[PDB]
Paper text:
This enzyme has three surface-layer homology (SLH) domains (~18 kDa); it is specifically expressed on the surface of the bacterial cell and degrades chitin. Based on comparative sequence analyses, [name] has two glycoside hydrolase family 18 (GH-18) [name] catalytic domains (~42 kDa each) and one carbohydrate-binding module family 54 (CBM-54) (~25 kDa), as classified in the Carbohydrate-Active enZYmes (CAZy) database.
Thus, two truncated mutant proteins have been prepared to determine three-dimensional structures, i.e., [name]-SLHd (Val198 to Lys1418), lacking the signal peptide and SLH domains, and [name]-CD (Val557 to Lys1418), which is composed of the two catalytic domains. The highest quality X-ray diffraction dataset was collected to 2.1 Å resolution from the crystal grown in space. The interpretable electron density map of the [name]-SLHd structure was obtained by the MR method using the [name]-CD structure and the Buccaneer software, and refined at 2.1 Å resolution. Based on the crystal structure, [name]-SLHd was functionally divided into three regions: CBM-54, the GS (glycine-serine)-rich loop and a catalytic region. The CBM-54 was predominantly a right-handed parallel β-helix (Ala214 to Phe449). The loop is located in the catalytic cleft of Cat-1 of the symmetrically related neighbor molecule in the crystal. [name], which has been suggested to be a monomer enzyme by gel permeation chromatography, is cleaved between Asn282 and Ser283 at CBM-54. In the crystal structure, the location of this cleavage site is on the SB2 face and in front of the 11th β-strand at the fourth coil from the N-terminus. Although it is unclear whether the two cleaved segments of [name] (120 kDa and 30 kDa) coexist on the cell surface, the crystal structure also indicated that the two polypeptides bound tightly to each other with 13 hydrogen bonds between the third and fourth coils and they retain the β-helix fold.
Residue numbers in the entry:
A (entry chain A): 214 to 282
B (entry chain B): 283 to 1416
The structure:
C-alpha cells in the first residue's frame, strides 16, 4: 500500500489495513488508520510535510525524509 | 515535517540524511523508542498523552549530524562514536547517559531544560544554562565540563569535573544586595541535673540586646533580656547562650528568642526545651481509687499516667468498654462482673483531684498496654487514623488531662500474635503520631495550654527494628523505655528483669537499652528509664550458687510476677528467702534454694536514678504505683534521688522497730535485741561489725550487730546481757550510728546517732494530769494510784514572778462572767487537793506527784526567763512551793516560748535561749534541793507538736536538764480549720500524707537529738470535731461547712452519755490507728476525732516499742469509767 497523493484515509471512522506502507511524497495526510506492519517515509518525502491523524503502527515506523518546517 | 497527531507509533528509526526531519507529537500521541541514525528534531506540542519516551543515538549516526530534543523524555542515550552533539532545547529527561563510545560528546542544555540524572562514561562537554539535578561521573567521564554546575555530583571521578566560567562554578558572584537585619538562628538546648535550661543561638547583628520568654509546663510566662539579665547571658562571636536559674520544673518548656538594634526588631523564633527530672507514675485503672486506703502522695512524682484507655471500633474508650479485658475467660464470672463495672470516671476524677496536693502534676491518658487490640487497624489508613486521633483528643478533653501517651505492644510483630499486626504498622505508627501532634498543636492555638505526646517503647532490638525512631522522635516529648521484663521465666536460666547494668554478655539492662536507643539517634533528653514495682519469678531453679544464672525447670505452677508490697510483707529476708545483690548489675534478687525472684528495691532504684542523672536522661518511669510498700518506699526513694541537692550527699536514715531492752533487777540485764530499719539507704545483705557503732551499752556487757532476721533492711543490735556494775535507776540512752560502709549505695554519709533505750526494772512511766479545779476529796470518782507512776497537778501559776496557787491568777479566775464560776475559782480547792494527793502518796508509796506550773494562757514565763535575777527568783519560789505542798518535782508548761500561742501570753524572740537558761537553773537548784533533802526531785516540761514549737525551743540543749518531756501528741486539728482529720492519731493516715501523728512528732523530736527515753507520748481524754461534714468516707478528710455549731471539746464522759449509739457510728482508720465517729444526721453531718481504748493501747505499744519513757494523758477527770486509763495500764504491763 505505497501512497503518492493528497489526504488519503477514513472520516469519522477508524479503518484497519495491514502490510508494509511507503508514503513516498510531500503533504500526504493519513487518517483514522490502524497499520499492522511497517510504515516507511523514504527520501522522496524530501523537505516537505506528512501529517498522521489518529493513526496506529503495530510494526516499525522509519522516517527517512521530511524537513524542519 | 512529520506530525503524529493523537496517533500511536511503535519503534521509530531515523536515518534522515544531511538536514533534519522535524518529528512532532500532538495531543494523545504515543511513540515507542526513537533510534537515531540521522539528523532529526523531536518535538512534543500540545501533548495530553505521553508521546516520546526512550531515545538512543546509535553508532550509525553520521559525523556532524544535528540531533535535537524538545519534550519530556525517559532514558536518552548517546552511544555514537561520530563526535556526537545532542541539543536539548526544552523540557525534561529522566536519565541521560553518554556512553564510553561517544568520543568528544557535547551536550547542549537550553535554559529551561531539566535533566534529573546525567551519567558520564566519556569526557563530555555540557553547555548551556540548562539544569542537571545529579551528574554521575564514572571513570570514563573524568575531566568533563559543565557551563553551569550540576545540582549534585556523584561517581568515582566527581572531583575531576570543571564548572562555571573561567572564574569557577557560580562565577564572580558579586554583589549583592543590601543585607542588614538582625536574624536569630537556634543552635540547640540542654538541661542538667540541677534543672537549668540552657539556650544556645547564633545572633547575627548582635547589638548587645535580646529578649527571651519562657513558658513553664504549668503555663507561667517568664521574660529575660540582655538589659536586665546579662548575668544569665554569655556572648561570643555569633554564639550567645542563655542560662536560666537552677531548679526549673521538670518537663517541657516553651521558649521564644529575638534580638534588635534600637527599633529594627528581629524575627521572633520559638521552640521546646526539656528540663530533666520527670517521674512518670503509671496508675492502674482497675484499682478503685475513690475507695483506696493505701493512698497516693503525688508530691513524689511529676506525671501520672492512667493505665489504660482502650480501643473499641477504632475509638478511644475507658477500659470497662474493652471486651477483650472484661470478658477474659481465664478469670471468674465474679471477676468479669467487677471488670465490667470498672469505675473509670470516678478514678479519673480522684486522680486529677490530686493536683490540689501537687499543682504541677500532669495527668495523661495512656492508651493501649499489654494485650490491648486495635492499633494496627486504627493506624491503617488516613480516615482510621482520623477517627482515632479525634477520639483520643475527646478522651483527653473529657477528663481534663494534660496529654496523651500511646503504649502499642507492639508494631509489626504484635508481641508475636498477642495482638494483630502488619508490616505497615511501622510507617503507620509514624503517621498516627504525626497526626496527634498536629491536632494537639491545633487545639493549643485556641486554648493556649501546651499538651504532651509520648509513647512507651519496647526494649528489644525487634522493637527498634519495627518503628521509625528518627522519624517519630520529633513528634514526641519523650519515649518511656520499658526497661523491665527483660528476662523472665520464659528463659531457660535465671537473670535480672530490670537491672541497671549488664553484668554478663547476654543480660539486657537499662544500660543496654539506653545505648540501643542513643545509637539510633534518639536524644538522651527524650529518654525515660523504666523501673518496676514487681518481680519476675522462676520456679524449680537448680540449687546452686545464689540461684542467679542457674538453670530452671518447669514453670507450670509459677505466679510469674509477685508485686513489691507482697515481697516486702512475706519474702524479702522472710520465709527462707535470702536477699542477694549483684554488684555489677546493681540489682537485688531473692533465692530460697528453688524459687528465684528478680526485683527492684531501694538500692536498685538509687542506682537507676544515678544512671539517669549521669547520662542526662529525661527521668524515671515506673510500672506501677500501687505495687509499692506501705510507706511508698520506692516512689519516695526515686523522688529523693532525682531531687537531691548537688554538693550534699544523702545521709543514711533510720527508724526504730524494737527500741527497748528492760533490766530484770537493779543490776541484771537480760539478753535483748534492738532493731532499726533504714529509712534511707540499703544495707548489704550481710553487714560487718565495723559498719555500725553502738554507744551506751554498760561496761562489761557484750553485744554484736547484724542484719535483723525477718526484715528487709534493718540493723539488729544483740545485747548479750549480764550484770551491770552498779544499780540502774534510770533509763540508759543507747545510740546507733549506721556507717556509710553499711549500705549498697555508693556515696552516702553516716546516719545520725539513733536513740534506743535500756529501761530500768520498773519499766515505763504512766503519768496522769490531775486537774486542780476538781475537788477530789468530794469527787465520787477517785484517783487510782496503783495504776499511775506519776501525777502532774494542774496548775500553779506565776504572779509577780512568784509561784502561786491558780486562784491567784485573776485572768483565770475571771475568765467567765458567771458569778458562780468566779466564786468557785476564787475558792479553788488547792489545799484540800494537796491533802488528797498526800493520801494517794500513802497507798502507792512509789507514786511521784509533781506540780505543773503554767498551762494554757498562763503568764509570767517570758518575764521570768529574762535575766539571771528573774530566773533565780522564779526558781527559788517554785522550789518553796514544791516543798510547802509536798511535791516530788516540778513540771513547767510554758505555752509557748517565742510565739506566745499567737498573742495569748507575752512573748519575745529571746524566750528560745532563755527557756534553756531557765531549765538549766531549775535543774541546778533541784540538784541542790535533792542533796539537802536526801532525795531526788524531777524536772519535766510539757511540750507541743508543731514545727513552730520545735523551732522556738532548743530541744537538743534542754533534754539534759529534764527527766522527760510530756509531748502533747494531740490537738493536731480542730474547729479552727474547715477540713476534717485526726486530732490525736498515733500514726499518720495513709490518706493524709505529711500529716501529724505521735509517730511523726516524736520522730521529729528525735531528729533534733532528744533521746527516746526523755520522751513521753500523750493521750487525750477529750474529743474535737466538725459539723456540716459531707457523708463521704464517713466524713474523714472531708471539706466541712459552717462551724458555728461545732461541738468544741467534749470529754470522753460526754462521748459516753451523749454520742455513742446516738446516731454516731464508730469508724477506724487502720493506717492511723485512730477512731472517729460520724453521724450524718446531727448538724449537717458531725465528725468526731478522739482517743479510745484501742488507740491508747497502740500509744502505749508505741512507747514500749520505741523506747520511750512512758505515756501521759490529759486528764484524769475526763473518763469516770477508768477504762481509758485501764487500757494504757494493761498494755504497759503486758
Ligand atoms: Na514524552
Amino acid at each position: 500500500a505505497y501512497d503518492k497523493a493528497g489526504t488519503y484515509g477514513p472520516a469519522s471512522g477508524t479503518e484497519t489495513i495491514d502490510g508494509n506502507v511507503k508514503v513516498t511524497v510531500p503533504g500526504v495526510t493519513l487518517r483514522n488508520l490502524v497499520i499492522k506492519g511497517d510504515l516507511l517515509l523514504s527520501e522522496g518525502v524530501g523537505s516537505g510535510d506528512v501529517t498522521l491523524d489518529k493513526v496506529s503502527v503495530h510494526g516499525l515506523t522509519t522516517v527517512s525524509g521530511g524537513g524542519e518546517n | 515535517s512529520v506530525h503524529m497527531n493523537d496517533s500511536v507509533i511503535g519503534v521509530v528509526y531515523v536515518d534522515k540524511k544531511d538536514t533534519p526531519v522535524r518529528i512532532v507529537a500532538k495531543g494523545s500521541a504515543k511513540v515507542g523508542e526513537v533510534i537515531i541514525a540521522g539528523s532529526v528534531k523531536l518535538e512534543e506540542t500540545d501533548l495530553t498523552g505521553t508521546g516520546f519516551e526512550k531515545v538512543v543515538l546509535k553508532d550509525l549516526l553520521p559525523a556532524n549530524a544535528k540531533v535535537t530534543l524538545s519534550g519530556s523524555f525517559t532514558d536518552v542515550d548517546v552511544a555514537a562514536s561520530a563526535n556526537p552533539q545532542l541539543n536539548v532545547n526544552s523540557g525534561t529527561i529522566e536519565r541521560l547517559t553518554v556512553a564510553a563510545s561517544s568520543k568528544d560528546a557535547v551536550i547542549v542544555l537550553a535554559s529551561g531544560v531539566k535533566v534529573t540524572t546525567l551519567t558520564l562514561n566519556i569526557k563530555t562537554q555540557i553547555k548551556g544554562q540548562g539544569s542537571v539535578g545529579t551528574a554521575v561521573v564514572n571513570l570514563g567521564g573524568k575531566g568533563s565540563s559543565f557551563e553551569s554546575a550540576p545540582g549534585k555530583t556523584e561517581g568515582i571521578a566527581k572531583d575531576s569535573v570543571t564548572t562555571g566560567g573561567s572564574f569557577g562554578g557560580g562565577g564572580y558572584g558579586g554583589g549583592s544586595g543590601s543585607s542588614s537585619n538582625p536574624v536569630v538562628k537556634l543552635i540547640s538546648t540542654a538541661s542538667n541535673n540541677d534543672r537549668q535550661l540552657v539556650l544556645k543561638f547564633n545572633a547575627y547583628g548582635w547589638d548587645n540586646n535580646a529578649t527571651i520568654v519562657l513558658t513553664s509546663p504549668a503555663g507561667k510566662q517568664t521574660t529575660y533580656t540582655y538589659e536586665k539579665n546579662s548575668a544569665q547571658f554569655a556572648v561570643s562571636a555569633p554564639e550567645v547562650t542563655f542560662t536560666s536559674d537552677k531548679g526549673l520544673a521538670a518537663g517541657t518548656w516553651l521558649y521564644s528568642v529575638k534580638t534588635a538594634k534600637g527599633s529594627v526588631t528581629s524575627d521572633t523564633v520559638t521552640g521546646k526545651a526539656f528540663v530533666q527530672g520527670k517521674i512518670v507514675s503509671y496508675i492502674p485503672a482497675w484499682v478503685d481509687w475513690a475507695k483506696d486506703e493505701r493512698g497516693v502522695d503525688a508530691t513524689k512524682f511529676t506525671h501520672l499516667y492512667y493505665a489504660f484507655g482502650r480501643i473499641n471500633n477504632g475509638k478511644v474508650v475507658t477500659i470497662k468498654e474493652d471486651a477483650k479485658w472484661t470478658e477474659d475467660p481465664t478469670i471468674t464470672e465474679a471477676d468479669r462482673i467487677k471488670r465490667r463495672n470498672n469505675p473509670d470516671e470516678s478514678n479519673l476524677a480522684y486522680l486529677t483531684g490530686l493536683k490540689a496536693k501537687n499543682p504541677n502534676l500532669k495527668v495523661l491518658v495512656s492508651i493501649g498496654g499489654w494485650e490491648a487490640e486495635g492499633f494496627s487497624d486504627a493506624a491503617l489508613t488516613p480516615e482510621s487514623r482520623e477517627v482515632f486521633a479525634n477520639s483520643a483528643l475527646d478522651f483527653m478533653n473529657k477528663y481534663n488531662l494534660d496529654g496523651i501517651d500511646l503504649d502499642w505492644e507492639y508494631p509489626v510483630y504484635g508481641a508475636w500474635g498477642v495482638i494483630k499486626s502488619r508490616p505497615e504498622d511501622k510507617a503507620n505508627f509514624t503517621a498516627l503520631l504525626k497526626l496527634l501532634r498536629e491536632k494537639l498543636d491545633a487545639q493549643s492555638t485556641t486554648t493556649n495550654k501546651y499538651y504532651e505526646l509520648a509513647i512507651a517503647a519496647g526494649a528489644s532490638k525487634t522493637y527498634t527494628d519495627s518503628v521509625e525512631l528518627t522519624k517519630i522522635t520529633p513528634y514526641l516529648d519523650y519515649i518511656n523505655l520499658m526497661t523491665y521484663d527483660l528476662h523472665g521465666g520464659w528463659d531457660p536460666a535465671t537473670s535480672h528483669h530490670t537491672a541497671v547494668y549488664s553484668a554478663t554478655n547476654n543480660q539486657l539492662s537499662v544500660d543496654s537499652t539506653v545505648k540501643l536507643y542513643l545509637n539510633n539517634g534518639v536524644p538522651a533528653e527524650k529518654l525515660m528509664v523504666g523501673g518496676a514495682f514487681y518481680s519476675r519469678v522462676w520456679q524449680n531453679v537448680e540449687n546452686k550458687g545464689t540461684g542467679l544464672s542457674e538453670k530452671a525447670g518447669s514453670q507450670a505452677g509459677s505466679p510469674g510476677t509477685i508485686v513489691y508490697s507482697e515481697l516486702v510483707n512475706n519474702y524479702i529476708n522472710k520465709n527462707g528467702y535470702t536477699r542477694y545483690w549483684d554488684d555489677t548489675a546493681k540489682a537485688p534478687y531473692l533465692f530460697n534454694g528453688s524459687t528465684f525472684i528478680s526485683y527492684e528495691d531501694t538500692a536498685s532504684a538509687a542506682y537507676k536514678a544515678e544512671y539517669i542523672k549521669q547520662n542526662n536522661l529525661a527521668g524515671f518511669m515506673y510500672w506501677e504505683y500501687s505495687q509499692d510498700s506501705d510507706s511508698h518506699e520506692l516512689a519516695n526513694t526515686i523522688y529523693s534521688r532525682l531531687y537531691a541537692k548537688s554538693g550534699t550527699p544523702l545521709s543514711v536514715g533510720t527508724s526504730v522497730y524494737a527500741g527497748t531492752v528492760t533490766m530484770a533487777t537493779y543490776t541484771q540485764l537480760p539478753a535483748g535485741t534492738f532493731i532499726l530499719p533504714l529509712t534511707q539507704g540499703t544495707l548489704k545483705p550481710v553487714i560487718s561489725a565495723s559498719d555500725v557503732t553502738v554507744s551506751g551499752i554498760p561496761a562489761g556487757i557484750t553485744y554484736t550487730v547484724a542484719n535483723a532476721a525477718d526484715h528487709r533492711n534493718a540493723v539488729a543490735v544483740y545485747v548479750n546481757g549480764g550484770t551491770v556494775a552498779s544499780n540502774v535507776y534510770d533509763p540508759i540512752d543507747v545510740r546507733v550510728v549506721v556507717k556509710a560502709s553499711a549500705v549498697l549505695e555508693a556515696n552516702m554519709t553516716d546516719s545520725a546517732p539513733a536513740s534506743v533505750t535500756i529501761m530500768p526494772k520498773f519499766g515505763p512511766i504512766l503519768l496522769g494530769y490531775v486537774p486542780g479545779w476538781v475537788d477530789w476529796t468530794n469527787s465520787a470518782y477517785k484517783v487510782d494510784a496503783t495504776k499511775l507512776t506519776h501525777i502532774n497537778y494542774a496548775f500553779a501559776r506565776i504572779k509577780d514572778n512568784k509561784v502561786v496557787k491558780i486562784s491567784e491568777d485573776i485572768n483565770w479566775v475571771n475568765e467567765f462572767p458567771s458569778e458562780e464560776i468566779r466564786e468557785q475559782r476564787r475558792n479553788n480547792p488547792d489545799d484540800a487537793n494537796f491533802a488528797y494527793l498526800k493520801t494517794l502518796k500513802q497507798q502507792n508509796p512509789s507514786l511521784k506527784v509533781l506540780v505543773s506550773i503554767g498551762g494554757w494562757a498562763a503568764e509570767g514565763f517570758s518575764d521570768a526567763a529574762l535575766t539571771p535575777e528573774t530566773r533565780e527568783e522564779l526558781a527559788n519560789s517554785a522550789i518553796a512551793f514544791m516543798h510547802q505542798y509536798g511535791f516530788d518535782g516540778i513540771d513547767l508548761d510554758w505555752e509557748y516560748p517565742v510565739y506566745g500561742a499567737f498573742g495569748v501570753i507575752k512573748s519575745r524572740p529571746e524566750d528560745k535561749q532563755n527557756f534553756t537558761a531557765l531549765l538549766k537553773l531549775f535543774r541546778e537548784k533541784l540538784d541542790v534541793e535533792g542533796a539537802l533533802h536526801g532525795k531526788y526531785y524531777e524536772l519535766a516540761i510539757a511540750s507541743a507538736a508543731a514545727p513552730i514549737y520545735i523551732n522556738s525551743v532548743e530541744l537538743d540543749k534542754i533534754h539534759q536538764y529534764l527527766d522527760y518531756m510530756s509531748v502533747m501528741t494531740y490537738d493536731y486539728h480542730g474547729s479552727w480549720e474547715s477540713k476534717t482529720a485526726h486530732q490525736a492519731s498515733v500514726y499518720t493516715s495513709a490518706l493524709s500524707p505529711g500529716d501529724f501523728s505521735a509517730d511523726s512528732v516524736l520522730t521529729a523530736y528525735r531528729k533534733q537529738g532528744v533521746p527516746a527515753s526523755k520522751l513521753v507520748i500523750g493521750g487525750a481524754f477529750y474529743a474535737r470535731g466538725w459539723v456540716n461534714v459531707p457523708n463521704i468516707n464517713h466524713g474523714l478528710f472531708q471539706q466541712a461547712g459552717d462551724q458555728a455549731k461545732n461541738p468544741g471539746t467534749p470529754t470522753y464522759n460526754d462521748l459516753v452519755k451523749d454520742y455513742f449509739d446516738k446516731g454516731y457510728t464508730r469508724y477506724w482508720d487502720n493506717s492511723a490507728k485512730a477512731p472517729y465517729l460520724y453521724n450524718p444526721d446531727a448538724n449537717g453531718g458531725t465528725f468526731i476525732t478522739y482517743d479510745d481504748e484501742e488507740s491508747l493501747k497502740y500509744k502505749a505499744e508505741y512507747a514500749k516499742n520505741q523506747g520511750l519513757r512512758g505515756v501521759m494523758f490529759w486528764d484524769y477527770s475526763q473518763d469516770i469509767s477508768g477504762k481509758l486509763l485501764g487500757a494504757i495500764f494493761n498494755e504497759l504491763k503486758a
